[PDB]
Amino acid sequence: DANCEGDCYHSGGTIISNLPFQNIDSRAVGKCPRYVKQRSLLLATGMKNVPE
Amino acid sequence: DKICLGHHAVSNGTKVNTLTERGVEVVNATETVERTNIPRICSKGKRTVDLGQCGLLGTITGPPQCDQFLEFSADLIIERREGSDVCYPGKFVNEEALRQILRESG
Amino acid sequence: GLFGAIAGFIENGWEGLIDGWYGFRHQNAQGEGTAADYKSTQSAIDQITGKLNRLIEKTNQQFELIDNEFNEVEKQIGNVINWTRDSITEVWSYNAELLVAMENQHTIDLADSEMDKLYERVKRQLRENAEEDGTGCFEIFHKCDDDCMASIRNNTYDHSKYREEAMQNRIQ
Amino acid sequence: GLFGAIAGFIENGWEGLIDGWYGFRHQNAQGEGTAADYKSTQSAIDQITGKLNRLIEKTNQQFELIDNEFNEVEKQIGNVINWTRDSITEVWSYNAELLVAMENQHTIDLADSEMDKLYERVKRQLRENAEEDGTGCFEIFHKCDDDCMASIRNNTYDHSKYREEAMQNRIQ
Amino acid sequence: GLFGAIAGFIENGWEGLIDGWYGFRHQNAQGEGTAADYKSTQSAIDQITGKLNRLIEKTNQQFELIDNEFNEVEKQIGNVINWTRDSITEVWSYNAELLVAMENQHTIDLADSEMDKLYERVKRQLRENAEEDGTGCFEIFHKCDDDCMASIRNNTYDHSKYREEAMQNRI
Numbered sequence: 290d291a292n293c294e295g296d297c298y299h300s301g302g303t304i305i306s307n308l309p310f311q312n313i314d315s316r317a318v319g320k321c322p323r324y325v326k327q328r329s330l331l332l333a334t335g336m337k338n339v340p341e
Numbered sequence: 342d343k344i345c346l347g348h349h350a351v352s353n354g355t356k357v358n359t360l361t362e363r364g365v366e367v368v369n370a371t372e373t374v375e376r377t378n379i380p381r382i383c384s385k386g387k388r389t390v391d392l393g394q395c396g397l398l399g400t401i402t403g404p405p406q407c408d409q410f411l412e413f414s415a416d417l418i419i420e421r422r423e424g425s426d427v428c429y430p431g432k433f434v435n436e437e438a439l440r441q442i443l444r445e446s447g
Numbered sequence: 448g449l450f451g452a453i454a455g456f457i458e459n460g461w462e463g464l465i466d467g468w469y470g471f472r473h474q475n476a477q478g479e480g481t482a483a484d485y486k487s488t489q490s491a492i493d494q495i496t497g498k499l500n501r502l503i504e505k506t507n508q509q510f511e512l513i514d515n516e517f518n519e520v521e522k523q524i525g526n527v528i529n530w531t532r533d534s535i536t537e538v539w540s541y542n543a544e545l546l547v548a549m550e551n552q553h554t555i556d557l558a559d560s561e562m563d564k565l566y567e568r569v570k571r572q573l574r575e576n577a578e579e580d581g582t583g584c585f586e587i588f589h590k591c592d593d594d595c596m597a598s599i600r601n602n603t604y605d606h607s608k609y610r611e612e613a614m615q616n617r618i619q
Numbered sequence: 620g621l622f623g624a625i626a627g628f629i630e631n632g633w634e635g636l637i638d639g640w641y642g643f644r645h646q647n648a649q650g651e652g653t654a655a656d657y658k659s660t661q662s663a664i665d666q667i668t669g670k671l672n673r674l675i676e677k678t679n680q681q682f683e684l685i686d687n688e689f690n691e692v693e694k695q696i697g698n699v700i701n702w703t704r705d706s707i708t709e710v711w712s713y714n715a716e717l718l719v720a721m722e723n724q725h726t727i728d729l730a731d732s733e734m735d736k737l738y739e740r741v742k743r744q745l746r747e748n749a750e751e752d753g754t755g756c757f758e759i760f761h762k763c764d765d766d767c768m769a770s771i772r773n774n775t776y777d778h779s780k781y782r783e784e785a786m787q788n789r790i791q
Numbered sequence: 792g793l794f795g796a797i798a799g800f801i802e803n804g805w806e807g808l809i810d811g812w813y814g815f816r817h818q819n820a821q822g823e824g825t826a827a828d829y830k831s832t833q834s835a836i837d838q839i840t841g842k843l844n845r846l847i848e849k850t851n852q853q854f855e856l857i858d859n860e861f862n863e864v865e866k867q868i869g870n871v872i873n874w875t876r877d878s879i880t881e882v883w884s885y886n887a888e889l890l891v892a893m894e895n896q897h898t899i900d901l902a903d904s905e906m907d908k909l910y911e912r913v914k915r916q917l918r919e920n921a922e923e924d925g926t927g928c929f930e931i932f933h934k935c936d937d938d939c940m941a942s943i944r945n946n947t948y949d950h951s952k953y954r955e956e957a958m959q960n961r962i
């Protein structure tokens with residue numbers, strides 16, 4: 290596909306993402322986010338939620 | 342007369358992990374691990390060569406499949422599973438080193 | 448939190464306050480009123496932004512293939528590669544999970560500080576004109592109209608022009 | 620950073636306080652008494668516990684044998700492995716020794732934070748009936764019997780009931 | 792900046808204070824004065840120093856050669872040796888930029904605390920004989936001469952020996 294631009298390729302396609310970590314292919318090549326075993330690591334962008 | 346000052350909150354928040362606790366609700370979170378794949382080679386603006394039935398080493402020797410890839414020039418080279426480097430049966434000594442040389446050869 | 452005002456003495460948050468993160472809610476003669484404090488809310492948002500600008504849009508390094516998915520490489524070298532890669536994955540998986548816990552612990556306490564900084568600043572404006580119950584409130588001991596309330600918010604409260612009046616009701 | 624509590628204006632700890640981590644020690648007409656505060660002591664314990672639960676006994680990846688202790692492998696492939704293994708071992712030690720300190724630093728400021736949270740809680744409880752000694756004490760300006768100190772502890776203290784007597788003894 | 796008091800209620804630093812890091816600046820009828828506080832200043836320096844002894848001057852293992860600049864090695868083993876080295880350089884670079892960012896963040900908050908701790912010590916020294924200005928100042932409600940200002944600094948201030956005037960003037 291010449292409609293999208295990506296720099297991280299693996300045998301199943303491209304990874305276009307600004308995230309530091311990926312979880313798609315440990316053998317991905319190019320300029321890739323680095324592979325983690327974890328499926329999801331949520332970064333807090335707010336305060337403790339103390340509702341009523 | 343009173344004046345009181347406090348912070349906001351929401352009904353349905355997002356649980357996160359900290360140094361000291363599992364699942365602590367917060368106002369917002371965003372993901373750090375990418376999972377959304379694109380099932381295509383994204384090649385916008387990249388000189389691409391899809392070797393197809395041509396094997397990457399077949400560009401050096403030129404078996405009949407590789408007649409169209411004898412002098413290619415690229416930025417992104419793609420090998421496919423059906424690529425065979427040979428017609429008359431045989432194999433390259435130190436094949437992968439030579440493949441690794443050609444993949445970054447341009 | 449670490450400064451105990453996100454869970455310590457502010458009992459709960461205000462789901463109605465969508466103006467900002469931190470804010471004022473007063474009560475006086477004219478009635479109720481709720482407003483948010485920009486200088487504080489933006490101080491924490493500008494800080495989370497720093498973290499995000501640090502974790503996102505990193506320009507990672509370029510790496511090449513050493514394996515082969517179609518024609519498997521020699522065994523002894525294929526294991527040194529499989530082994531090495533599996534080891535680095537440990538490091539990054541550890542580095543990723545630890546970094547988030549470090550950051551999430553920091554952000555959650557960071558927000559506290561902004562609450563306590565606001566609280567302990569407003570209290571100084573009301574030097575001896577008011578007393579704090581301990582729920583995140585300030586019992587004002589003089590007539591504070593809706594203009595006097597807004598006086599507190601933009602830090603124009605002249606403690607002197609209410610003091611003698613306030614000190615009187617304070618002791619009787 | 621630190622808070623003023625642990626090493627600071629609280630000079631020493633109470634080797635006699637085995638009931639918990641934090642606690643009260645009043646003095647009044649009917650004698651002396653010492654009792655631990657549950658909410659703060661447990662609050663710290665529920666935190667250090669959360670740290671161990673992250674380190675102790677977690678799935679660790681299965682690693683295999685690339686090397687050989689009986690029949691040494693080729694010197695060239697063997698020097699690469701010895702080098703990769705040593706490069707990782709530095710990583711795993713930088714990470715560990717840093718992690719322990721980063722936690723130790725946090726844990727030590729953590730318990731410190733919990734004491735200040737206890738202290739400044741009680742301050743608000745006795746609005747104007749007491750002044751802070753500065754050594755971690757509150758000079759109480761009314762008469763506080765045993766069921767008074769107990770009311771200070773379990774957060775039943777009604778400061779409006781003692782205020783008039785208190786505000787008199789102070790100013791004079 | 793978790794405690795205020797550096798970008799917080801304290802307006803700005805004093806460029807003239809070259810004695811220590813934190814200090815007192817008093818104003819009374821006998822004139823003007825400015826001096827340092829050894830306890831707070833040295834308790835931050837001692838900490839900042841402890842960080843330096845943790846990163847500076849640390850030995851590492853001996854690493855020998857597996858490459859060759861002159862007589863290049865076989866390619867297949869070369870791209871592996873390179874791929875590994877380039878992978879460890881990522882790890883140590885990430886560990887470096889993160890360690891320093893976390894280190895500075897703790898350093899700056901470390902100085903907030905020691906400022907704020909000094910401000911809170913004084914506040915409970917003079918108990919009810921002074922009020923919180925809000926800019927880091929204490930309006931003393933009793934005449935405190937240069938010998939009395941010195942009492943606040945070296946922690947010999949007895950608030951009872953002035954507690955009487957104090958309250959009479961706050962009302």
Ligand SMILES: *[C@@H]1O[C@H](CO)[C@@H](O)[C@H](O)[C@H]1NC(C)=O
Nearest residue numbers: 334335355368369370371372
């Ligand atoms: C909340 O976080 C999500 C994560 O994707 C983001 O898309 C959204 O913009 C955030 N909203 C606010 C109000 O911060």
Ligand SMILES: *[C@@H]1O[C@H](CO)[C@@H](O)[C@H](O)[C@H]1NC(C)=O
Nearest residue numbers: 316519521522523525526529
């Ligand atoms: C190395 O790992 C790949 C999958 O990542 C596997 O297909 C291959 O068989 C492994 N090679 C050896 C020698 O174990």
Ligand SMILES: *[C@@H]1O[C@H](CO)[C@@H](O)[C@H](O)[C@H]1NC(C)=O
Nearest residue numbers: 691693694695696697698701
């Ligand atoms: C690798 O290190 C081991 C000890 O862990 C040693 O016995 C062996 O001689 C080393 N191999 C080489 C090639 O240096």
Ligand SMILES: *[C@@H]1O[C@H](CO)[C@@H](O)[C@H](O)[C@H]1NC(C)=O
Nearest residue numbers: 864865866867868869870873
């Ligand atoms: C490995 O990297 C060096 C530069 O650090 C480069 O000069 C060398 O050619 C690379 N190895 C191979 C086999 O290309």
